[PDB]
């Protein structure tokens, strides 16, 4: 789950994903058309009363 946006990262033509330190995907390439789109989970945080 997450939001998607356009990417300024220049993927090499043989690359598909982009990985993070905790083995989660940072950016992915769309399989239909060749464009690079980012991966970022939706807004969350703690709630204090």
């Amino acid at each position: 789950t997450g939001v998607l946006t356009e990417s300024n990262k220049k993927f090499l033509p043989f690359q598909q994903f982009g990985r993070d330190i905790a083995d989660t995907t940072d950016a992915v390439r769309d399989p239909q058309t060749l464009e690079i789109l980012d991966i970022t989970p939706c807004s969350f945080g703690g709630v204090s009363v």
């Binding site: 990262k9 090499l12 043989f14 690359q15 598909q16 994903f17 982009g18």
Partner: protein, 224 residues
Amino acid sequence: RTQSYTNSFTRGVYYPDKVFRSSVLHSTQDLFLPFFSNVTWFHAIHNPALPFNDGVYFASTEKSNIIRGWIFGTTLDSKTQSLLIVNNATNVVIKVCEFQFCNDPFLDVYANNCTFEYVSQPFLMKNLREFVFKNIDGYFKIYSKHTPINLERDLPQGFSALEPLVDLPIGINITRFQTLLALHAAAYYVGYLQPRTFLLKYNENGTITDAVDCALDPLSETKC
């Protein structure tokens, strides 16, 4: 052929995965070329074949369009397993040739089984130009991979990248290794890869800029 000797000079670092990383000091464990290793400087004017011992790092500094392809195989004679790659400039075909086709192998210019007819694009691609190859067998799929370079010396000072090129999923028990010349003087380098742990340095681009061989000297072990 003349068997000279040259050190590898921190050349042959390659991309181990199809994953974009940026500004991460990632440490991999793949079959790399060890730093400062005795590669060979075969001067081909004369001819038995070379071993394929867990991957062959191939380099050649020719510009006159001489180097063509290789005969990655096992026994290359007849009637045996004989699944030998007939790797060429553009026809990367896996024909069982039995005996040696194209007469004795020099690429003159001027039945059993009929399977695995793989055909692909032009495999390779103004004073000097050096071709760098890192053919590994690996797990079933043979990986063949090429990078360009600008300046040409006897494996000069510098770092390069890989840019993987093909991923042919065919080839069984390759132990012996050949090389095609162009005859109507080659001077190609051969290095042998070993399983070692590397520490690759990326940047803002997707580009391996530096690498550290984690078992060369104790300083590199401290760095890793």
